[PDB]
Short mmCIF file of all heavy atoms in Angstrom, two decimals:
data_model
loop_
_atom_site.label_atom_id
_atom_site.label_comp_id
_atom_site.label_asym_id
_atom_site.label_seq_id
_atom_site.Cartn_x
_atom_site.Cartn_y
_atom_site.Cartn_z
N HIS W 32 -6.04 8.45 24.65
CA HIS W 32 -7.14 7.74 23.93
C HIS W 32 -7.47 6.37 24.55
O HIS W 32 -6.60 5.74 25.18
CB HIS W 32 -6.81 7.60 22.45
CG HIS W 32 -5.75 6.62 22.05
ND1 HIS W 32 -4.37 6.83 22.25
CD2 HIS W 32 -5.86 5.56 21.21
CE1 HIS W 32 -3.71 5.85 21.66
NE2 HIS W 32 -4.61 5.08 20.96
N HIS W 34 -7.52 3.18 23.83
CA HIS W 34 -6.91 1.93 23.30
C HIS W 34 -6.20 1.21 24.46
O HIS W 34 -5.58 1.88 25.31
CB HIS W 34 -6.00 2.23 22.09
CG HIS W 34 -6.77 2.39 20.82
ND1 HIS W 34 -6.16 2.75 19.64
CD2 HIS W 34 -8.08 2.23 20.52
CE1 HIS W 34 -7.05 2.81 18.67
NE2 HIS W 34 -8.25 2.50 19.19
N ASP W 36 -3.57 -0.79 24.58
CA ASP W 36 -2.11 -0.50 24.49
C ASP W 36 -1.72 0.66 25.41
O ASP W 36 -0.61 0.67 25.87
CB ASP W 36 -1.71 -0.09 23.06
CG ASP W 36 -1.27 -1.24 22.17
OD1 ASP W 36 -0.82 -2.27 22.70
OD2 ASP W 36 -1.39 -1.11 20.94
N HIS W 37 -2.60 1.62 25.63
CA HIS W 37 -2.32 2.92 26.32
C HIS W 37 -3.00 2.97 27.69
O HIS W 37 -3.08 4.08 28.27
CB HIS W 37 -2.76 4.07 25.41
CG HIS W 37 -1.81 4.27 24.28
ND1 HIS W 37 -1.71 3.38 23.24
CD2 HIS W 37 -0.90 5.23 24.05
CE1 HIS W 37 -0.78 3.79 22.41
NE2 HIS W 37 -0.25 4.92 22.90
N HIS W 114 -6.75 10.06 15.44
CA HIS W 114 -6.41 8.63 15.49
C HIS W 114 -7.65 7.77 15.74
O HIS W 114 -7.72 6.63 15.20
CB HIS W 114 -5.34 8.45 16.55
CG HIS W 114 -5.08 7.04 16.96
ND1 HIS W 114 -4.43 6.12 16.16
CD2 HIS W 114 -5.28 6.43 18.14
CE1 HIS W 114 -4.25 5.01 16.88
NE2 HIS W 114 -4.73 5.20 18.04
N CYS W 115 -8.54 8.22 16.61
CA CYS W 115 -9.81 7.55 17.00
C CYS W 115 -10.65 8.57 17.75
O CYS W 115 -10.13 9.59 18.16
CB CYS W 115 -9.56 6.28 17.82
SG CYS W 115 -9.10 6.51 19.56
N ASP W 135 -1.08 8.41 20.18
CA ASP W 135 -1.17 7.87 18.80
C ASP W 135 -1.73 9.00 17.93
O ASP W 135 -2.72 9.63 18.34
CB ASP W 135 -1.98 6.56 18.77
CG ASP W 135 -1.22 5.33 19.24
OD1 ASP W 135 0.02 5.41 19.36
OD2 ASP W 135 -1.84 4.27 19.49
N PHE W 317 -4.32 4.10 11.17
CA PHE W 317 -4.53 4.82 12.45
C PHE W 317 -3.34 5.74 12.75
O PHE W 317 -3.43 6.53 13.72
CB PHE W 317 -4.64 3.80 13.57
CG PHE W 317 -5.91 3.00 13.62
CD1 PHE W 317 -6.72 2.83 12.51
CD2 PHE W 317 -6.28 2.37 14.80
CE1 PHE W 317 -7.87 2.07 12.59
CE2 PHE W 317 -7.43 1.62 14.89
CZ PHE W 317 -8.23 1.46 13.79
N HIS W 318 -2.24 5.56 12.00
CA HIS W 318 -0.92 6.18 12.32
C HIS W 318 -0.32 6.87 11.09
O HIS W 318 -0.48 6.41 9.96
CB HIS W 318 0.06 5.16 12.92
CG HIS W 318 -0.46 4.39 14.08
ND1 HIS W 318 -0.37 4.84 15.39
CD2 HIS W 318 -1.05 3.17 14.14
CE1 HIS W 318 -0.90 3.94 16.21
NE2 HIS W 318 -1.33 2.89 15.44
ZN1 LIG I 1 -4.06 3.80 19.60
#
Side-chain angles (χ1 to χ4, degrees):
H32 73 286
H34 279 176
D36 268 336
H37 285 71
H114 167 72
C115 76
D135 282 346
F317 287 23
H318 308 273

